[PDB]
Enzyme design. Structure first.
Site, PDB file in Angstrom:
ATOM      1  CE1 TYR A   1       0.833  -0.688   4.478  1.00 35.75           C
ATOM      2  CE2 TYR A   1       0.479   1.669   4.311  1.00 35.75           C
ATOM      3  CZ  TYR A   1       0.961   0.579   5.002  1.00 35.75           C
ATOM      4  OH  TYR A   1       1.571   0.754   6.222  1.00 35.75           O
TER       5      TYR A   1
ATOM      6  CG  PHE B   1      -0.200   9.215   5.217  1.00 40.85           C
ATOM      7  CD1 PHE B   1      -1.178   9.502   4.283  1.00 40.85           C
ATOM      8  CD2 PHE B   1      -0.335   8.072   5.987  1.00 40.85           C
ATOM      9  CE1 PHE B   1      -2.261   8.666   4.114  1.00 40.85           C
ATOM     10  CE2 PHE B   1      -1.415   7.233   5.822  1.00 40.85           C
ATOM     11  CZ  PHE B   1      -2.380   7.532   4.885  1.00 40.85           C
ATOM     12  CG  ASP B   2       2.297   4.030   5.985  1.00 41.40           C
ATOM     13  OD1 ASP B   2       3.526   3.827   5.908  1.00 41.40           O
ATOM     14  OD2 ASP B   2       1.517   3.259   6.582  1.00 41.40           O
TER      15      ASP B   2
ATOM     16  CB  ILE C   1      -9.247   2.062   9.717  1.00 40.64           C
ATOM     17  CG1 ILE C   1      -8.530   2.250   8.382  1.00 40.64           C
ATOM     18  CG2 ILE C   1      -8.405   2.635  10.849  1.00 40.64           C
ATOM     19  CD1 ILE C   1      -8.539   3.676   7.869  1.00 40.64           C
TER      20      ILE C   1
ATOM     21  CE1 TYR D   1      -5.472   5.150  12.177  1.00 38.30           C
ATOM     22  CE2 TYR D   1      -4.766   6.477  10.318  1.00 38.30           C
ATOM     23  CZ  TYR D   1      -4.646   5.344  11.093  1.00 38.30           C
ATOM     24  OH  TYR D   1      -3.695   4.402  10.785  1.00 38.30           O
TER      25      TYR D   1
ATOM     26  CG  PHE E   1      -4.794   3.982   1.704  1.00 41.98           C
ATOM     27  CD1 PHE E   1      -3.564   4.099   2.324  1.00 41.98           C
ATOM     28  CD2 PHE E   1      -5.926   4.370   2.396  1.00 41.98           C
ATOM     29  CE1 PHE E   1      -3.465   4.599   3.606  1.00 41.98           C
ATOM     30  CE2 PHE E   1      -5.832   4.870   3.678  1.00 41.98           C
ATOM     31  CZ  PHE E   1      -4.602   4.984   4.283  1.00 41.98           C
TER      32      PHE E   1
END
Lengths: 107, 820, 49, 387, 371
Positions: free
Chosen positions: A26, A36-37, A56, A82, A99
């Site tokens: 991902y 961010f990731d 999540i 979140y 994502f």
């Protein structure tokens, strides 16, 4: 919530089932486009078990919708993510997440 | 976007980005693992590794990125391992038994000219593992509330890849330095080397490197000194002072590894030798028993050894260093020779036994340090101190082992798991010494202390606990929070309560622990000024436990500490409590609660094991008379109402609301002033009675004892004691529809107040006349005995007042009647 | 990072995607400015949108 | 206006510095003799010890310090030797009184009373008031002799500088208050003239005075200079020059810009408004730099400093003051709040990319090897996620 | 207790291992004597390859020992509230102090050669700034007793042994050039902290010794503690020996400076401070004599406390003698006007009564000799 758009096709027959480990790569970006990731950066696939609430709701449902070997874009709302609290320091409060997720295999 | 390498010429952006990396390091500094996880998003491991590999990166950015990697991923684990590296807890396992000082070699198995390569081999000293968590930002956010979830672990980075990369970078840097290129990586030799050496030192201290990796590092340091059966090594390559400091750090690590090897070899030899000694002693005892041993004196002299304490037996059995006959030391020649050979080997390893090439780590370090100092006038104080500490250790390695041994400890295999858990908790506590205390740190500290107390090893190995020094660490945390805003009411009261409880229980565990905590008595008394806000254990309680029922410590008590406690008592007796005044309590002028606490400490100081300590009692009495305000307003001479009148007034205050409480609560309406006054006066009378001299001294007619008894008698009239004993006690009675009307023990006259008076009457005045005995019995004792008897019914039997009456009788009244 | 592949048309003067950094997050190709018009299979690229 | 015997750090503070002034102008530096009439002057306040009919022993103003009230003398003993006369001699004269060794009684020449300590008042012991009021009594106590201790040249110069600077800055504050609420409009400033030139020169001189030692100096010389600098900073802040500087800064900050200041003070005065503000901030930074005691004073009034960070006239100076405070005092770090951190981040946002603000945030994160987890968390949350 | 029998062979292996480690450390490792101080000092003093560096500069770069002394001087000169304890400094100070060895009737030649050898050994140090380092550390201690000041005083004594005139002149020059009151303020504070005989502490120690142990030695503390009476007698002797060695050889400049420091803003009369400590010691000894007057025989603990107190008094008397000899007229006048006469009177009283009492019994012959 979660919206799925197929970037690349999968087998179209094998789908994740509850209690079955899913292995993915991902790349996570905010709705603005800021990354961010990303698991590809760590060079190690991310494995998670469906139905254990380890990820999540957006991941749960979107990855459940995807098929093995499929690459897809998942748009996840704040409520399915979140949410109001957010992830302090990474995800701003009340943020939609985009994502790029490739489902490698199921184990 | 641009290429980050453009910052070589874009200096302003270069400075801003370097300071941004510094800010990242600061925000994740000193154990902020959650913030490190957060930063893993902004600077991913791919970026970090690419920055490590990059050779065109500017020097400042290279150093910043190396330091950022160390901070995010390695700094916390490195700190924990470094903190735990100073102690040597070696389990008695077969791996430990296999350890020897010198490697088995062809030239000589033990005591050759060839030491084993430092940091290479088997080490059994217990070090807690390293804990890491994946940097994942898609996992569900914990549903737990604040401080309920466990403290986050440091983000994980592939350690095998990191170590391989670090070794490759160090090798490339060494080769480039040999080549003497005109464009060093980072723009300077310092920028090329210092980051790589910092990373390598961090990884070494963490212990991730394997034996082969350590061999490669040692060969880079010196291809000649460290060799297995290119010339330029790091230690001889004309390096700047920062690189020299990094090399000093590496050499310090290797010297520490050599010291650890020495300690572990000593522990293994100790195991083998003590096994042999115990077998020999058992055989000797068997021979002695089997022998008729007609000679009574001879058999008694033989059995003195077996009757001596085990430590004395060990000392006597080892006392053959300069020679000794069988009679003086009954150890066989072979057993003695084994220890002599091991001593020779240990001296050889330490270098005590006495070419231009070093041919060993110790000669290498000494020669390198001396050569650096000779070559240049070192301008770095840190570098100078590092090299000279190394040189001192190397010239005195035997002293190094001597200073290290106190921290060495041997444990059985069964205790390894519990010891590892205890080390985890102690590491958490130590890590909490570098952060300002907050709610989450408070919760973590309380959990760690509770786990340590529950741990079995905390009981069985108090010497290990003292060697670890966890009592000092807990006191450091407690005193940090206490000094923080000392004038203001201390925050985090429950953590101070937990620390005080842990320290009191530590004192209770063992007598040596009591001595260790007593050594810090004056400082606990310094911090005892503020108290009773916790409502639990206090530093004053820790001080009292540090001396309770220990006659040696009571004798060693210091007069200045006694004066400090007496001054606190005088202050409490002179001014009211600000906390109570803020709550809204009436202002009575003095502080009975604090007075009672300090009186309790003085009681513990003066009275030990059922007998008064004459020196402490005399000192305390003299200080109290010198400061009359300690006795309280009632006993103050000029306008004192007297002890009996004061007790009656306290009873009236307790009866009347709005005079004993705010009357505008966690425990019994906080404090009831009516009960507090009586408690203070009872504690004062108890303390004086304890200070009363002993009957044997009185019979001997010691002038000091008679003087002290006269002073106490003058202070406390006998009629006042008799009247206070005679004062009626409220007792439970059936009322309404059988509902029980009980006195509130926390807010009324209770039998303990009379018990203190009885103690004073017995110790000071004594009962010697039949007329007086009958008088006191008729007026004050018999009514209470009859009330206790009448409260023997099924309904009243278990009442708190009935139980208090039973305790009062059996502890104070009935024994007095037995004596009389 | 995902492989980049775009096909389209570009204007002679103005389409100068120099190697390295540039507009946005770098990797500028067809459609990352207003001088080119590209198709990547799923999106129509122009002006870096 | 009252005199006490005190035994705390006042023995090192400048408030306890007195200057002996013989009545003779010429040869006033001659050796001091027993029974010689002289006036004792308080250096920092410039007030003379004297006797008044209403309040007894007090320090009176120079205007009211006539010879009868303020004339004193040192005497070897309390005996009646005053009958013996003495004539002034041109020259240094015989050395009679000696520092430290000699014990001397102070006597008021006119009244003849002896300088002694007033009888301790009740409840003072419980208040903990160590200071004991001094008063002139006909008889006095047995232990009335006073030892004379010389003060170092730096201490004496600092006391005189404090006196002069306090006078000048009080005059400046009074001048500002004169027209604080009066809008000039078109006309005269409508207030008392400001000592602009004197204030500027004094601020420059004080900045030079408090300039930190140069790094290139040898270690021993640098340590001695650092000791002197710390002592002088402590002297000034004990005498209250820091509070006076803060008052001046407040009075000047009441005005947003130079034109706004001109609206109340005139164009000529406004021409030196920005310079004076910058000099005041620089002097504050010099006073507090490297002094933990001085920096901790800002714990109570941190908002006073943070709120001024957005001001554009002396932004760099205010940032420097904040940097010094945060570097030195951990108490400020303990009291930091989210609003302050957000204000610093707003400085980053509005004033551009300045590495000094990043240094300020780094100092906020950790101090003296102890990390403030709340500060770290707030900085991360308020700065990083925005990207 | 005999039935209990507490055998060692029954004890668990790990406990026996720990006790063996403790005993081996105490008896074998600790007793081992290794002399490395002289070798270390020689190696650090030696400078190598200087011809290869070809340095023609007037100021040759300091050799490693010089750099070490300079580093410690820097640490001392650094401004701080307190002097932090430093194991490295203490160890290196001990090494430097032991370097100066201070090692049948010796002939005139042998004595002179020994004196010259000691002078060379002390030169190896005071040529590197050891005297200035000692003064700086004594100033830095700020009057706080501890291992740091103890090591500093021991090093000073080592370099000053025999009345080293060169070291004395170097110390005087440094003190008069710096004109700092910290050194003498610290010396005065250390004297004020120096302790004397304490009868209350003696009684407490006697009671503690009377208290005995019933459990095992390996389980009880065993009531083994530093003596409460005259605990810092060694430090007091070191302080007064340092002050004596300053004036040793009739150095009139010190004999005047200790009385009055002209350059400094404030002066401290070290002579009168010594007299005050002597008076305190005399009062303590008189009290302790009064304690023992009634008793027929002084026990061993009393004899030991007498020996410690009289050794300290002997050192103080030697210090005063070196203060006044030469003669130093200023010091003579100061002592004549000080309270020395009262101390001498008290000492005469104690001397007479102790002489009689200790002569009455033979077991006290050594104490009588020392008296």
């Amino acid at each position: 919530g979660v919206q799925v758009e197929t970037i690349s096709p999968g087998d179209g027959r094998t789908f994740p089932k509850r209690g079955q480990t899913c292995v993915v790569h991902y790349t996570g970006m905010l709705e603005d486009g800021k990354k961010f990731d990303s698991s590809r950066d760590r060079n190690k696939p991310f494995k998670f078990t469906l139905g254990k609430q380890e990820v999540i709701r957006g991941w749960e449902e979107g990855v459940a919708q995807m098929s093995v070997g499929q690459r897809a874009k998942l748009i996840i709302s704040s409520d399915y993510a979140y949410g109001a609290t957010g992830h302090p320091g990474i995800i701003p409060p009340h943020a939609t997440l985009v994502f790029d997720v490739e489902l490698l295999k199921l184990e | 976007c641009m290429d980050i390498l453009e910052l070589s010429e874009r200096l302003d952006l270069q400075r801003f980005h370097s300071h941004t990396l510094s800010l990242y390091r600061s925000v994740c500094a000193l154990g902020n693992n959650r913030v490190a996880h957060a930063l893993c998003s902004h600077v991913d491991q791919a970026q970090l590794l690419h920055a490590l590999e990059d050779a065109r990166l500017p020097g400042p950015l290279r150093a910043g990125y190396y330091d950022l990697l160390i901070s995010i991923h390695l700094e916390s684990a490195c700190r924990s391992r470094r903190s735990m590296l100073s102690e040597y807890i070696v389990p008695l396992t077969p791996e430990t038994r296999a350890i020897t000082l010198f490697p088995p070699g062809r030239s000589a198995e033990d005591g050759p000219r060839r030491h084993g390569l430092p940091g290479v081999g088997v080490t059994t000293s217990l070090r807690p593992p390293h804990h890491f968590s994946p940097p994942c930002f898609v996992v569900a956010l914990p549903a737990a509330g604040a401080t309920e979830a466990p403290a986050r672990l440091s983000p994980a980075i592939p350690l095998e890849a990191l170590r391989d990369k670090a070794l490759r970078m160090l090798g490339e840097a060494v080769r480039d330095g040999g080549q003497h290129a005109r464009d060093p990586v980072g723009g300077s030799v310092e920028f090329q080397f210092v980051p790589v050496l910092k990373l390598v030192s961090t990884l070494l201290v963490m212990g991730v490197f394997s034996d082969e990796d350590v061999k490669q590092i040692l060969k880079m340091i010196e291809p000649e000194v460290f060799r297995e059966e290119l010339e330029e090594g790091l230690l001889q390559m004309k390096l700047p002072e920062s690189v020299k400091l990094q090399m000093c750090h590496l050499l310090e690590y290797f010297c520490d590894q050599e010291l650890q090897h020495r300690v572990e070899s000593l522990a293994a030899f100790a195991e083998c030798y003590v096994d042999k000694m115990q077998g020999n002693q058992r055989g000797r005892y068997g021979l002695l028993m089997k022998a008729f041993t007609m000679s009574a004196a001879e058999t008694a002299r033989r059995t003195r050894e077996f009757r001596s304490p085990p430590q004395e037996q060990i000392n006597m059995l080892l006392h053959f260093k300069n020679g000794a006959d069988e009679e003086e030391c009954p150890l066989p020649e072979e057993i003695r020779q084994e220890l002599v050979n091991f001593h020779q080997d240990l001296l050889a390893h330490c270098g005590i036994q006495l070419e231009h090439k070093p041919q060993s780590l110790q000669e290498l370090v000494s020669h390198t340090v001396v050569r650096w100092a000779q070559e240049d006038f070192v301008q770095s104080p840190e570098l100078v101190r590092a090299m000279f500490s190394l040189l001192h250790r190397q010239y005195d390695g035997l002293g190094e082992l001597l200073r290290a041994l106190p921290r060495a400890y041997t444990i059985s295999v069964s205790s390894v798991e519990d010891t590892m858990s205890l080390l985890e908790c102690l590491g958490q506590i130590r890590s909490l010494l570098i952060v300002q205390m907050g709610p989450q740190e408070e919760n973590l500290m309380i959990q760690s202390i509770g786990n340590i107390m529950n741990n079995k090893v905390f009981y069985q190995h108090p010497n290990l606990m003292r060697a670890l020094g966890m009592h000092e660490t807990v006191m450091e945390v407690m005193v940090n929070v206490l000094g923080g805003g000392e004038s203001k009411e201390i925050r985090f009261p429950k953590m101070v309560t937990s620390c005080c409880r842990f320290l009191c229980y530590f004192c209770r565990i063992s007598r040596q622990n009591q001595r260790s905590m007593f050594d810090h008595l004056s400082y606990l008394l310094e911090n005892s000024g503020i108290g009773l806000g916790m409502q639990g254990s206090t530093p004053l309680d820790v001080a009292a436990a540090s001396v309770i029922d220990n006659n040696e410590l009571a004798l060693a008590l210091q007069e200045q500490d006694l004066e400090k406690v007496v001054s606190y008592l005088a202050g409490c007796g002179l001014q009211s409590c600000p906390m109570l005044l803020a709550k809204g309590y009436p202002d009575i002028g003095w502080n009975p609660c604090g007075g009672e606490r300090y009186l309790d400490f003085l009681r513990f100081a003066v009275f030990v094991n059922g007998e008064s300590v004459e020196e402490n009692a005399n000192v305390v009495v003299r200080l109290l008379i010198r400061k009359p305000e300690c006795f309280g307003p009632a006993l103050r001479g000029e306008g004192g109402s007297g002890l009996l009148a004061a007790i009656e007034e306290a009873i009236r205050i307790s009866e009347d609301p709005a005079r004993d409480g705010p009357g505008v609560p966690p425990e019994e309406n906080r404090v009831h002033l009516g009960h507090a006054i009586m408690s203070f006066y009872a504690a004062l009378i108890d303390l004086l009675g304890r200070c009363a001299p002993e009957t044997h001294l009185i019979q001997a007619g010691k002038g000091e004892a008679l003087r002290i008894r006269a002073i106490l008698r003058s202070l406390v009239p006998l009629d006042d004691l008799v009247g206070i004993i005679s004062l009626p006690l409220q007792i439970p009675t059936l009322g309404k529809d059988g509902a029980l009307v009980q006195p509130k023990m926390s807010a009324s006259f209770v039998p303990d107040h009379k018990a203190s008076m009885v103690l004073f009457l017995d110790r000071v005045y004594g009962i010697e006349n039949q007329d007086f005995l009958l008088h006191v019995l008729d007026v004050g004792f018999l009514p209470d005995m009859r009330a206790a008897a009448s409260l023997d019914t099924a309904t009243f039997s278990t009442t708190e007042m009935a139980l208090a009456l039973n305790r009062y009788l059996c502890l104070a009244v009935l024994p007095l009647i037995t004596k009389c | 990072q995902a492989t980049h592949l775009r096909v389209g048309w570009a204007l002679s003067e103005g389409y100068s995607p120099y190697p390295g950094g540039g507009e946005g997050w770098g990797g500028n190709g067809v459609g990352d400015d207003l001088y080119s018009y590209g198709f990547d299979g799923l999106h129509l690229w122009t002006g870096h949108v | 206006r009252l005199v006490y015997y005190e035994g705390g750090p006042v023995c090192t503070h400048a408030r306890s510095l007195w200057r002996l002034e013989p009545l003779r102008i010429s040869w006033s530096g001659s050796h001091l003799r027993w029974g010689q009439p002289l006036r004792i002057r308080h250096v920092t306040t410039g007030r003379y010890l004297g006797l008044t009919e209403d309040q007894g022993l007090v320090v009176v103003d120079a205007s009211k310090a006539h010879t009868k009230a303020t004339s004193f003398c040192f005497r070897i003993s309390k005996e009646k030797l005053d009958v013996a006369p003495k004539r002034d001699v041109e020259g240094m004269g015989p050395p009679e009184i000696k520092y430290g060794e000699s014990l001397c009684f102070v006597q008021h020449v006119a009244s003849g009373l002896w300088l002694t300590y007033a009888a301790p008042d009740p409840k003072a012991l419980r208040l903990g008031v160590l200071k004991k009021k001094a008063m002139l009594h006909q008889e006095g106590h047995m232990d009335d002799a006073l030892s004379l201790t010389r003060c170092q040249q730096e201490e004496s110069q600092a006391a005189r500088m404090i006196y002069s600077t306090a006078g000048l800055y009080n005059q400046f504050i009074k001048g500002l208050d004169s027209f604080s609420g009066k809008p000039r409009g078109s006309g005269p400033p409508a207030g008392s003239a400001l000592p602009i030139e004197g204030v500027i020169l004094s601020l420059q001189d004080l900045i030079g005075y408090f300039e930190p030692p140069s790094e290139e100096l040898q270690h021993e010389e640098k340590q001695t200079k650092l000791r002197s600098l710390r002592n002088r900073q402590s002297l000034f802040q004990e005498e209250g020059m820091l509070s006076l500087v803060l008052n001046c800064i407040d009075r000047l900050n009441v005005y947003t810009t130079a034109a706004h200041f001109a609206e109340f003070a005139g164009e000529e005065a406004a021409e030196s408004w920005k310079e004076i503000v910058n000099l005041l901030y620089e002097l504050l930074a010099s006073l507090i730099r490297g002094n933990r005691t001085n920096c901790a004073l800002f714990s109570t009034n941190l908002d006073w400093l943070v709120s001024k960070l957005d001001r554009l006239e002396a932004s760099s100076g205010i940032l420097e003051v904040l940097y010094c405070v945060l570097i030195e005092s951990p108490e400020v770090l303990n009291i930091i709040q989210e609003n302050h951190i957000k204000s610093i981040i707003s400085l980053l946002d509005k004033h551009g990319r300045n590495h000094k603000v990043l240094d300020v945030l780094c100092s906020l994160c950790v101090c003296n090897g102890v990390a403030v987890r709340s500060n770290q968390d707030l900085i991360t949350e308020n700065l990083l996620p925005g990207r | 207790a005999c039935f209990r029998m507490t055998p060692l062979y029954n004890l668990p292996t790990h406990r026996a291992c720990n006790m063996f480690l403790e005993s081996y450390k105490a008896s074998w490792i600790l007793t081992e004597d290794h002399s490395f101080e002289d070798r270390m000092i020689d190696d650090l003093s030696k400078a190598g390859e200087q011809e290869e560096e070809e340095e023609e500069v007037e100021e040759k770069k300091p050799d490693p020992l010089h750099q070490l002394v300079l580093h410690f001087s820097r640490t001392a000169l650094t401004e701080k509230s307190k002097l932090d304890e430093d194991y490295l400094y203490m160890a290196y100070a001990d090494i430097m102090a032991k370097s100066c060895h201070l090692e049948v009737e010796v002939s005139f030649e042998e004595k002179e050669m020994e004196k010259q050898r000691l002078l060379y050994q002390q030169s190896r140090l005071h040529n590197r700034g050891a005297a200035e380092m000692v003064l700086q550390m004594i100033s830095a201690c700020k009057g706080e007793t501890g291992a740091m000041v103890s090591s500093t005083l021991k090093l000073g004594i080592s370099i000053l042994n025999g009345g080293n005139a060169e070291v004395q002149q170097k110390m005087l020059d440094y003190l008069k050039d710096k004109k700092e009151v910290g050194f003498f303020q610290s010396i005065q504070a250390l004297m004020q902290t120096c302790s004397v005989l304490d009868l209350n502490a003696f009684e407490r120690q006697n009671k503690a010794e009377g208290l005995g142990m019933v459990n095992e030695d390996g389980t009880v503390i065993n009531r083994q503690n530093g003596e409460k009476v005259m605990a810092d007698d060694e430090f007091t002797q070191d302080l007064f020996r340092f002050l004596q060695l300053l004036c040793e050889g009739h150095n009139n400049d010190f004999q005047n400076y200790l009385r009055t420091q002209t350059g400094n803003t404030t002066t401290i009369n070290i002579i009168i401070c010594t007299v005050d400590y002597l008076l305190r010691l005399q009062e303590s000894i008189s009290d302790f004599y009064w304690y023992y007057s009634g008793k027929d025989v002084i026990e061993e603990q009393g004899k030991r406390n007498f020996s410690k107190a009289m050794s300290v008094a002997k050192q103080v008397f030697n210090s005063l003698t070196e203060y006044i000899q030469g003669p130093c007229t200023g010091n003579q006048q100061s002592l004549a006007h000080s309270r020395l006469w009262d101390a001498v009177v008290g000492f005469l009283h104690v001397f007479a009564h102790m002489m009689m009492k200790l002569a009455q019994d033979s077991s006290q012959i050594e104490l009588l000799k020392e008296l």
